[PDB]
Curated annotation (Swiss-Prot), chains A, B, C:
It is a multi-pass membrane protein. It is found in: Cell outer membrane. Changing D371A: Decreases inhibition by hexaamminecobalt(3+). One of its GO terms (biological process) is enterobactin transport. Residues 250-265 have a biased composition (Polar residues). Forms a continuous, solvent-accessible conduit: a 'channel-tunnel' over 140 Angstroms long that spans both the outer membrane and periplasmic space. The periplasmic or proximal end of the tunnel is sealed by sets of coiled helices. This is Outer membrane protein TolC. It comes from Escherichia coli (strain K12). NCBIfam families: PRK09465.1, type_I_sec_TolC. Residues 53-60, 258-278 are extracellular. Homotrimer. Part of tripartite efflux systems, which are composed of an inner membrane transporter, a periplasmic membrane fusion protein, and an outer membrane component, TolC. The complexes form a large protein conduit and can translocate molecules across both the inner and outer membranes. TolC interacts with the membrane fusion proteins AcrA, EmrA and MacA. InterPro entries: Bacterial_OMF, OMP_efflux, T1SS_OMP_TolC. GO terms for cellular component: cell outer membrane; efflux pump complex; MacAB-TolC complex; membrane; outer membrane-bounded periplasmic space; periplasmic side of plasma membrane. The gene is tolC.
């Protein structure tokens, strides 16, 4: 299948990304829980007591019950207001981390895809080698029979061939376990997928460095979080400072209050005391609180938040310096990836002409078999190296985009025009 | 000492494991703390105080002393029962982590043990390669003495010999460190270890791909945990919801209360209601509390607990996906391992192109030394590959059992039979 | 600039070390927050309530305001004293974290610097391996047209040359990436860096491994913090069992409160009138509290604390077990590094003499270019390694200082002498 079909059937079925969503959804959900202390609170209370102790002055037994609707409404708290802003501040950061975890999923699917893709290429070339030197191995054990080739050359040929049996083995395994990186970031066994078309290939020169660096130090997801995180630490210098500010609360209630009286000293009593008191209530009130001095606590908390700000500040410096080098580094990687293909292709023909001339030398008996087996292995390496440079450019293209922050569907779309022929993924 | 003796010494002492033990013993003990708020709560407290006539209170100033036994008891506080369940679940997860860690100690002890043995093989084979090159250098010198060998041949030999001395250096340094590795797991230095006896090396395949996948879905330790934690998230919804329910509480007091007055004792129009009041009471009242509208707070948390559940459900698929691509991965690996032993077992056989052919013809003047050297590396470049591949097998059996979660003390009892020959860790 | 200078530029500008500082500075500042509950706690408050009649209250309303000046002063409370002790010990463990971070920068700088120096050497030599084989190619094709026909083996020399272009390619890149690397840590691009002076280069044996070990055990910073943390655990045991102790308090407050009544009850008396009650009071009081039983909470708290202390002890074992294995590695690593310098040192003079003889031979026609290229390749390999070995040495020399925890500017000044000849960080 096409890349944008492996990823397509993977982005909606990705167990990490969705958890990142459920994290953001909960982070946004409590935007209400942080608001709730700024709304009227209402409860229903009901008590029943049984008093029974006795006098050295008072005494007497009683039975009281009660019920009420209490209400509270904050008027000027600020810290309750502050906790609301912080929860808004903190959900934005959690929304960027999701936008970041969206970013990552692209790469990992692409990377795991090409992991499998050039895993074939290696096993494919090891199969191409293991047989191209089976031609050399066969004819030589017949050229030996004519007596033209020594009793020693064949022995060396057989041993070099066996150490290609081993390479082929740990090239199958490399293809298998690569499929087992894709069956995770995707959750699918793909029996075939689109190989990159060899001649349908054009290496476009990466856009200039300083232009990429400016664009990134604005739309990059990593310093955005670090900036929003300096915002969070900043509003916390304010949160600590609220511990000086006064507070104003409103109460309103409607209660009932019954009483009864038991035993002796209650029966046959004088006046109002045994009297069963059955009354209720309607209250409305205002409470005001202002801290004068407390151990220098709220002081300490401010400096603490200030230092925490210096921190989150330097943490941005780390985040900026990181991006500073992610663009340069991958820009060097996409440049070098150009020169690499333009060098390894040159070495494919150079190793090629050297090979066929050795087979011409193996003919007419002017050259050895151990000499042509050097010619073959140095050819197939040049090819293998050529394959890698192609994939490293593709992967470093995404990186240079992803460092900017601008990695999306469209970047992954323009890469379907490059690939074509569907290749097998089974090491049989 | 052998693998079981070395392992069992590690079990006793290993600080990583015993920490992981305390972390579980503490967590289990926390059940008692989490249960405490359900049992009776018995406090006590005295309370002296002194009043003053600041305005109309003039000439009325009190001093009252009071003591009291205070008892509270929960009769249906739902959130408290939930706290106990949550903590039992908390300790359930914590016992499973401790189990994983037991698995980890085993895999580590063996991993580190089969480093020392491999280090010994790279050393052996290097100084075997070293001592062999010295033979062919020796007889080349004395052939050059009698003018049969061009100086380049000797210059070449001595060059290759000098690399091998440099290799014989890094080979000893590795073994030196690999000992120090074994000691920071185990706690002891080992003057000798039982090496792999190659004569009776069994290489029987594994159980089919599916038999493991099944077995590693009932028995596997890291998945069992992702289950237990999705459970914990469920039980946490239940917890959140309990913010709606009413709470009922039994209370009981009994305490003295002695006041006295003195100031403008008595003037007029009142009565001596300022007599030395010596109170005693004996309360046993139970009370009820139910919340109506709490600012939409309790629902946010119900929604959040649900979003957090979806997330805990997400990372259960993630854990499952891990499990597949660890059994499948570890299966492929044990295949390539056995498959590799064969390939490298013949590669060593065919590498006796060095044996005859090269060594033979060199001694009778036929083959050039440079070529005889290239043979006498290829053989040893296969000797190491073989022994290395064998120890890769022995820790791919163990790797599967880790995925199956059945990895235990028994599986070492197997591998201790494979060993036999006591070889020293600090040769020469 | 030089190693010493690059550090001074990074010391003041590094975002990581400066963030560490902020974390330490906050920690120390917290000792004030922790101390604050032991000091007086002054607070002003004000109320207003309107009560309205219901049943037996029907026809009685009230308007009451009050204003007080409250103060709380803890007399005896071990927990509040324990909180302060703990915060200080917290700040201490933070301080050792900071000291550790100071070191990591030093070690990290050196690594990045000698990586730029190593990428120079790797490139500088690749070009000298490229230029040697270009002469090789030129001063061969001159003879090829005329004399000894090289149709089969001048194409091999051309393929040889093409791979050393793809090699110099990668080399060019590993210099850029290694500089951006140095930048991140230092916040500087460097055109010039002081390189190692081979003439000036000596090697000094390390102090005996036992002297080192003893020295580490007494001032290694990881072990120091490990001991501090185990102390924290112990003190947290005491903190738990402070639950058993009583809490003697003091509260002083001077207040003002007045109630004015309204409704169907304005004929009667409380004293001279049953209406106005403007009054104030001055209060001072002690407040004894003592828990007697509470679900066995405190008992389990101490059991947890104790178990948790076992983990701190086990962690202290892990630390020591580590410092042992680190110190002994750092020792092994340095001795092997000297022993390697010596080996590769001879490996060049050997490789030179081999090539010297090969150049001379081929110069007459007694040797082939295939052999003169192989000989040139192995000379630059040895020169590569030798360069690499000395740079490694210096690192292992700092590593050992880092293991016994004494690494500082002094050590970075030491190496400054061995550097001198300034090299460009990109000639192209
Ligand atoms: Cl304050
Ligand atoms: Cl609600
Ligand atoms: Cl208790
Ligand atoms: Cl110790």
């Amino acid at each position: 299948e096409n890349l944008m079909q492996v990823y397509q059937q993977a982005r909606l079925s990705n167990p990490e990304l969705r958890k990142s969503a459920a994290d953001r959804d909960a982070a946004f959900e409590k935007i209400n829980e942080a608001r709730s202390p700024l709304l009227p609170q209402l409860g229903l209370g009901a008590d029943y007591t049984y008093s029974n102790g006795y006098r050295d002055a008072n005494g007497i037994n009683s039975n009281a019950t009660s019920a009420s609707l209490q209400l509270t409404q904050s008027i000027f708290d600020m810290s309750k207001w502050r906790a609301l802003t912080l929860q808004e501040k903190a959900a934005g950061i959690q929304d960027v981390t999701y936008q970041t975890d969206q970013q990552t999923l692209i790469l990992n699917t692409a990377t795991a895809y090409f992991n499998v893709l050039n895993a074939i290429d290696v096993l494919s070339y090891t199969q191409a080698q293991k047989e191209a030197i089976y031609r050399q191995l066969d004819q030589t054990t017949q050229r030996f029979n004519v007596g033209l080739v020594a009793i020693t050359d064949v022995q060396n040929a057989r041993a070099q061939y066996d150490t290609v049996l081993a390479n082929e083995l740990t090239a199958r395994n490399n293809l298998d376990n690569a499929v087992e990186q894709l069956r995770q970031i995707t959750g699918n066994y793909y029996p075939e997928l689109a190989a990159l078309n060899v001649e349908n290939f054009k290496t476009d020169k990466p856009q200039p460095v300083n232009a990429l660096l400016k664009e990134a130090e604005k739309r990059n997801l990593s310093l955005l979080q670090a900036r929003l995180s300096q915002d969070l630490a900043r509003e916390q210098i304010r949160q600590a400072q609220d511990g000086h500010l006064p507070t104003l609360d409103l109460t309103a209630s409607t209660g009932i209050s019954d009483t009864s009286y038991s035993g002796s000293k209650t029966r046959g009593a004088a006046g109002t005391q045994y009297d069963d008191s059955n009354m209720g209530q309607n209250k409305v009130g205002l409470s005001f609180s202002l801290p004068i001095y407390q151990g220098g606590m709220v002081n300490s908390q401010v400096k603490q938040a200030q230092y925490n700000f210096v921190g989150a500040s330097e943490q941005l410096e780390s985040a900026h310096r990181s991006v500073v080098q992610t663009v340069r580094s991958s820009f060097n990687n996409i440049n070098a990836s150009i020169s690499s293909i333009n060098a390894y292709k040159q070495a494919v023909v150079s190793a090629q002409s050297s090979l066929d001339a050795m087979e011409a030398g193996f003919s007419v008996g002017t050259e050895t078999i151990v000499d042509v087996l050097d010619a073959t292995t140095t050819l197939y390496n040049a090819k293998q190296e050529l394959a890698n440079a192609r994939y490293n450019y593709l992967i470093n293209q995404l990186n240079i985009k992803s460092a900017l922050g601008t990695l999306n569907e469209q970047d992954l779309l323009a890469l379907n025009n490059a690939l074509s022929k569907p290749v097998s993924t089974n090491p049989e």
